[PDB]
Structures are given as C-alpha cells and as structure tokens.
Symmetry: none
Subunit: 133 residues, 2 copies
C-alpha cells in the first residue's frame, strides 16, 4: 500500500528477505526496496523491479536522490496471474535474488549493508507475506 | 479427511449450501476450499477460499485457463489455531456468500458462471469434521 517492514537494528550479512505474493492479472510492475531510513527520498541500497509490461527485471540503487546504473536479471521469472516466492539474501558482497527456488541474480553492494533500515514493497503486487530472518 | 473431494456432477444452482465443519489444528498455516469446474487437474476454479492463519488474512480468488485473477480479502481472519469452525458457502444468483460462525463474513461476486461448478475440494492445514452440500 506500500508494505513497510522497519529494520531499526539493520540487517547483518546472512539475512533473508522472503517475499511471497501474487502478480495480479493486469500487473505492470512492482518493486522491493531496501531503504536507509524512514524519510522520503531515503537512499536505496537495493531497488528490485520486475517489470511485467516490458518483460525485464531491473536492479538498481539510489544515493542522494540519484540512481545508479541499472542491472538486468536473466529473463523474467514472474507472470501475471501466477504466485511467486522471492528470497533476497544479504551477504558480505551483495544481495542474492532467488526466485522460485533458483538462483537468479547477484547484485553487488553499492551502499554499505549497514545502512539498510527499511524494506518497502509497492506496485502491482498482492502480497502474501514479507518475512525477514 | 484432507485432501477431501465432493463430486457435484449435476452442478450447483442458486440455493446450494456448502457446509464445512472442522478444526484448525494447533500449528496450522493455512487451508483452502475450492469450487472447481471439473475433476481434471488444473480445472478452472469458480471460487478459491483461502484462510491464512500465518498471515491473519482470508483470501478469495478465481482461476481461469490456469491463471489466477485478482485476490479479494475479507475483514480480519475469523479462524484461530486450536479452534473448531463452521463455514457456509451459499450460492445465490449474484455470488457466493461466505458465512463463518453464525455471521455473514464476505460476499464473492460470481466471476465464473455458477453452472460450471462441478467439484468441491477442501485441503491444507485443517482437520475436517464434515463436508455437506444441500
């Protein structure tokens, strides 16, 4: 609405963000953001953006209001009308994106993991659960 | 008694009452009741009724040509781990009335025609007492 999960103590290398939901029938795109605070315009360590309308999955970061260079995942492991399960796994050198029990993309840290304070999910998605271990 | 299947080869009409009684067991995540349009796997689902104890929601949806529609949600979750329940799913001309514990809980407008329903399928984390169709 967007969904928000606050992480005031940050997340350590060895953290799993598990997201399950349904991509609805007319979905254009949705996003999962790991933000550095609760304020508007907060920096993004990771912006994860499956785009159903253009058949791409874009990864990016945002720092001081300005976006970095987009990375793209190999293919689109999402489909309108289908449920999904995504793991975003924080490691020492980046985030591992796991979709449907298959390694999908590695996004190397651009901001220090130590700054992440919030997980935000928005867009054309119908959330089943958002869990942080 | 899960997975539980009740064949309705002559279909259902306005005034059909699906009465389901059971227990949500102590470590339950979720269960479902499906009104399916045939016995074959992947049959269209006129109604998918999905109480989720783990996320404290009840989701309603449909399935057509293998792809799900847009989820509808009821208010809260009128189920609890460790508690017995009594659900009526009542077919009218306009939709399915979901009744839980002596009270109207949600109205699901028909997405598929009532006349296509051919099968009830209760499954997931529930310990079924009885499934009756009137």
């Amino acid at each position: 609405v967007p969904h928000k999960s606050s992480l005031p103590e940050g997340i350590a290398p060895g953290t799993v963000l598990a997201i399950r939901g349904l991509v609805p029938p007319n979905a254009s795109r949705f996003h999962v953001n790991l933000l550095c605070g609760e304020e508007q315009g907060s920096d993004a360590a990771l912006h994860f953006n499956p785009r159903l309308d253009t058949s791409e999955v874009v990864f990016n970061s945002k720092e001081q209001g300005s976006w970095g260079r987009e990375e793209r995942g190999p293919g689109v492991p999402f489909q309108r009308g289908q449920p999904f399960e995504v793991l975003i796994i924080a490691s020492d050198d980046g985030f591992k994106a796991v979709v449907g029990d298959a390694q999908y993309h590695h996004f190397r840290h651009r901001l220090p993991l130590a700054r992440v304070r919030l997980v935000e999910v928005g867009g054309d998605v119908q959330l089943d659960s958002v869990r942080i271990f």
